[PDB]
Amino acid sequence: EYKTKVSRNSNMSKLQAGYLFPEIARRRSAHLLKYPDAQVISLGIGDTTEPIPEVITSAMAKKAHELSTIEGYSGYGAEQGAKPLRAAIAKTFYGGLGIGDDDVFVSDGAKCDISRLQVMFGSNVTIAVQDPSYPAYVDSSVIMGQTGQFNTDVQKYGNIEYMRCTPENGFFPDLSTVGRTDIIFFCSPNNPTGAAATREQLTQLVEFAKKNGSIIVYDSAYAMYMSDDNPRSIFEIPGAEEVAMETASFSKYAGFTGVRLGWTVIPKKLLYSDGFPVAKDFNRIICTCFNGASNISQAGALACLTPEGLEAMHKVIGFYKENTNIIIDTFTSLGYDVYGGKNAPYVWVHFPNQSSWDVFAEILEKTHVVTTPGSGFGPGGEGFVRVSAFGHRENILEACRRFKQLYK
Amino acid sequence: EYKTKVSRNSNMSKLQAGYLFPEIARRRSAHLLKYPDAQVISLGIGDTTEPIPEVITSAMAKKAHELSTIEGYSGYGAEQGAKPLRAAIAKTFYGGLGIGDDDVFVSDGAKCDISRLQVMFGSNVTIAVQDPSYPAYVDSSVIMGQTGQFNTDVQKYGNIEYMRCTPENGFFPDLSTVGRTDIIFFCSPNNPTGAAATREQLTQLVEFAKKNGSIIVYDSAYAMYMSDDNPRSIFEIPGAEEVAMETASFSKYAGFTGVRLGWTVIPKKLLYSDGFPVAKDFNRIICTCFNGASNISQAGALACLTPEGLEAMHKVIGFYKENTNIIIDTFTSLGYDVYGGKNAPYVWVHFPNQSSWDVFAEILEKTHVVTTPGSGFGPGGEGFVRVSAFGHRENILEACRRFKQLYKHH
Numbered sequence: 001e002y003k004t005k006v007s008r009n010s011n012m013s014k015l016q017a018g019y020l021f022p023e024i025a026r027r028r029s030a031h032l033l034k035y036p037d038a039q040v041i042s043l044g045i046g047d048t049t050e051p052i053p054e055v056i057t058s059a060m061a062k063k064a065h066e067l068s069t070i071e072g073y074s075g076y077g078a079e080q081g082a083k084p085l086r087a088a089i090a091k092t093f094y095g096g097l098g099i100g101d102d103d104v105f106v107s108d109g110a111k112c113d114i115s116r117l118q119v120m121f122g123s124n125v126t127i128a129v130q131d132p133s134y135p136a137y138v139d140s141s142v143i144m145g146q147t148g149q150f151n152t153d154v155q156k157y158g159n160i161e162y163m164r165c166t167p168e169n170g171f172f173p174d175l176s177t178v179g180r181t182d183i184i185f186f187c188s189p190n191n192p193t194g195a196a197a198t199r200e201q202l203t204q205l206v207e208f209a210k211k212n213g214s215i216i217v218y219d220s221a222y223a224m225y226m227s228d229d230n231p232r233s234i235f236e237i238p239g240a241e242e243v244a245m246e247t248a249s250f251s252k253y254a255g256f257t258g259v260r261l262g263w264t265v266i267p268k269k270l271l272y273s274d275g276f277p278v279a280k281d282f283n284r285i286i287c288t289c290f291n292g293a294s295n296i297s298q299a300g301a302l303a304c305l306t307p308e309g310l311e312a313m314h315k316v317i318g319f320y321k322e323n324t325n326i327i328i329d330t331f332t333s334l335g336y337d338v339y340g341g342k343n344a345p346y347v348w349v350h351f352p353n354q355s356s357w358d359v360f361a362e363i364l365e366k367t368h369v370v371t372t373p374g375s376g377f378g379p380g381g382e383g384f385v386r387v388s389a390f391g392h393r394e395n396i397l398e399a400c401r402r403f404k405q406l407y408k
Numbered sequence: 409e410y411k412t413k414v415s416r417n418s419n420m421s422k423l424q425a426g427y428l429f430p431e432i433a434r435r436r437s438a439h440l441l442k443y444p445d446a447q448v449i450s451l452g453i454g455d456t457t458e459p460i461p462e463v464i465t466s467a468m469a470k471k472a473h474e475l476s477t478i479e480g481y482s483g484y485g486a487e488q489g490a491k492p493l494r495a496a497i498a499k500t501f502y503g504g505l506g507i508g509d510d511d512v513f514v515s516d517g518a519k520c521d522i523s524r525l526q527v528m529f530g531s532n533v534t535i536a537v538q539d540p541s542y543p544a545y546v547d548s549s550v551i552m553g554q555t556g557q558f559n560t561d562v563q564k565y566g567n568i569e570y571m572r573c574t575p576e577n578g579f580f581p582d583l584s585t586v587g588r589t590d591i592i593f594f595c596s597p598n599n600p601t602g603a604a605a606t607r608e609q610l611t612q613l614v615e616f617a618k619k620n621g622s623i624i625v626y627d628s629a630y631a632m633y634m635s636d637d638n639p640r641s642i643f644e645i646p647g648a649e650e651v652a653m654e655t656a657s658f659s660k661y662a663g664f665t666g667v668r669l670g671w672t673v674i675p676k677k678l679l680y681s682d683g684f685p686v687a688k689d690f691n692r693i694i695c696t697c698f699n700g701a702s703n704i705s706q707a708g709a710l711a712c713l714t715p716e717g718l719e720a721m722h723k724v725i726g727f728y729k730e731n732t733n734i735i736i737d738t739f740t741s742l743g744y745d746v747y748g749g750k751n752a753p754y755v756w757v758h759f760p761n762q763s764s765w766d767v768f769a770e771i772l773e774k775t776h777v778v779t780t781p782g783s784g785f786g787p788g789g790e791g792f793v794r795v796s797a798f799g800h801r802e803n804i805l806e807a808c809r810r811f812k813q814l815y816k817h818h
């Protein structure tokens with residue numbers, strides 16, 4: 001058979017397996033082959049399940065209709081996003097934090113921004129991540145060439161600072177033990193642990209990044225699930241604007257997982273070591289490597305940031321928060337050390353003395369419930385299982401009775 | 409003032425200037441500053457201007473509505489795209505060329521795929537491009553670390569094979585003078601020249617790639633504007649499936665420039681030197697770095713690939729083609745050497761003894777018409793201006809009468 005003479009990207013070769021979530025989907029498929037008549041309930045991938053509020057979808061349908069009129073048609077937008085949408089995001093989420101409209105970059109969601117930001121930083125930066133954390137930070141790092149080889153002994157790529165977040169440290173890194181890196185990806189409330197950093201901790205994090213001369217990439221995907229009195233934006237920490245940017249999404253707020261709309265904020269005062277503004281390189285990436293978020297998605301996001309839209313999102317979030325309570329109560333009633341599930345739609349359940357992957361297989365096997373194994377979120381996740389709360393109420397309740405029977 | 413200790417990405421420093429189209433938009437902004445009441449006609453950026461056909465927007469509006477019901481709501485999709493849409497694209501554009509549903513990757517547009525493909529190839533490959541060509545191939549290449557610095561004497565980035573496409577060579581390079589690279593980006597019908605490679609030239613292109621062990625990234629963004637009897641897909645060339653992938657989009661077919669939907673096709677027989685299939689690395693990129701095209705944009709694309717959609721897309725394309733004729737006739741009456749416009753919605757006009765940027769500025773200042781300087785598409789574009797045919801009819805007519813008024817007495 002014919003082969004080209006092009007060498008495979010050696011960074012792609014470094015990757016230890018496929019992406020976590022397709023891997024889980026494979027395993028659930030194999031389970032449906034074994035049990036063809038099983039009633040599978042997925043609490044694995046954190047995908048929203050409830051309909052998008054009408055006020056928002058009417059806004060999208062109206063934009064679609066308008067595209068068939070001479071007056072309403074629009075083509076290429078500003079790749080940063082429509083100005084009224086940047087303004088609404090700037091006012092609504094960062095009002096009083098000194099963020100301008102021109103600091104907001106509208107995207108087709110946060111996973112894409114994470115990789116666009118990794119392209120921008122390039123192959124010579126080193127990164128630190130929460131351990132455990134959402135696997136896209138590590139995987140994108142490997143793909144960009146920022147890392148060594150995977151070491152199977154410790155279960156870690158070389159050259160990544162894994163910042164262990166444990167029950168014994170309150171799921172916040174011990175910063176006095178953390179090596180300096182260029183970038184620090186920091187997710188709060190955290191996926192998978194559910195842990196939301198306090199004001200004092202985030203203060204420490206800014207002080208840490210300021211002294212090490214690092215950039216924090218603050219992932220606030222779950223901030224509007226906040227219950228405790230904790231900061232929802234890193235820019236609430238004075239001095240954050242010199243060391244941090246923030247990336248977020250409408251996915252978990254308006255059910256936009258399929259619709260695709262997020263943003264990144266890069267403050268004017270965030271500068272590389274030569275004084276060059278980081279935002280200006282992001283802007284170049286965004287103009288060259290992207291052609292803007294869908295116009296219909298942007299019209300849906302615009303409608304989200306209005307009194308009716310905010311009320312609708314609060315209702316949605318509230319509903320998933322009530323699912324989370326149900327799951328928490330179940331596991332606590334069962335005598336588990338269960339974490340998170342207060343400030344986030346994830347509960348982080350401790351299964352000590354078992355490997356995550358084995359617990360995943362066991363639950364899937366006995367209860368036809370998909371979970372996500374903790375060690376898919378890095379080596380600090382070993383021994384835990386993340387349980388997602390996105391589901392119809394009846395599905396959540398049924399999964400919980402199934403757990404009660406397995407584990408009684 | 410405070411600065412971090414993070415070193416700016418050296419590949420970002422390499423970029424000689426801002427991306428082409430924002431730089432034009434800046435100049436048009438400054439123009440409207442100077443003359444706030446100028447009726448600017450924009451033929452710079454190639455943006456669709458006519459309404460999306462009702463059949464396509466009704467489908468999108470329906471998906472939006474369905475998203476508010478328990479039954480019709482959907483969240484994350486298969487990252488490659490909805491299986492029915494992948495099938496429709498495979499059958500509709502590649503039916504009979506051996507392309508499977510699973511070789512199609514639905515994206516939010518071709519610009520985005522180009523850059524995801526470049527992340528996939530990585531920093532250690534060398535590329536070739538047509539010269540002139542759509543500036544995203546070269547810019548994404550610089551950004552990814554594939555290049556040396558910009559050399560202002562020759563107006564080229566180091567380590568890129570710039571393949572000369574001229575009126576004299578029929579806008580197809582002499583491949584005997586083209587050095588071996590890993591990757592060859594090839595656009596046909598080409599942006600900016602409008603030139604469509606014949607079956608004979610594409611066969612040569614494929615034979616060249618096969619003997620060199622190169623991968624062709626074939627960009628078919630304008631293939632449905634074909635008038636001549638030329639291949640619309642690289643996979644029409646036997647053996648293309650061992651050396652070639654293809655990228656395209658609905659932007660120019662249904663006016664989806666703002667909606668955002670295209671696709672890349674990578675065939676199963678495309679392998680790296682170690683035997684690894686290139687599509688398996690792309691799939692990983694697509695799973696890690698992307699979360700799918702918008703579900704509403706997918707519903708719109710699915711509606712385009714029906715008898716009613718194809719009929720609507722064909723009609724809109726033909727409209728822009730008549731615009732292109734008006735523009736061609738205008739410049740040829742004024743005695744310019746003018747290329748393209750046959751197989752593409754672009755007219756490539758030569759201005760002897762003038763820089764492209766000076767011509768751009770001159771047209772913009774005197775007629776309030778925006779164009780794109782040919783040097784924006786690389787050094788072979790120097791001396792040319794690209795005139796986009798996208799616009800309302802009356803605006804193309806007005807632009808053309810402005811050109812004639814300016815240039816008739818010279």
Ligand SMILES: Cc1ncc(COP(=O)(O)O)c(CN[C@@H](CCC(=O)O)C(=O)O)c1O
Pocket residue numbers: 021044045046047108109110111112134187191219221248249250251256257261262699
């Ligand atoms: C921390 C974090 N950042 C970013 C994203 C991606 O946001 P989008 O705007 O919708 O791109 C997610 C969703 N993570 C889910 C879904 C799986 C995935 O993102 O690959 C999860 O962790 O199960 C997330 O949890």
Ligand SMILES: Cc1ncc(COP(=O)(O)O)c(CN[C@@H](CCC(=O)O)C(=O)O)c1O
Pocket residue numbers: 291429452453454455516517518519520542595599627629656657658659664665669670
């Ligand atoms: C050859 C070619 N490939 C890809 C694209 C991008 O397609 P999308 O699906 O809409 O992402 C264009 C449109 N280029 C236009 C618009 C400017 C730009 O693409 O940056 C042009 O060249 O004027 C193109 O001309």
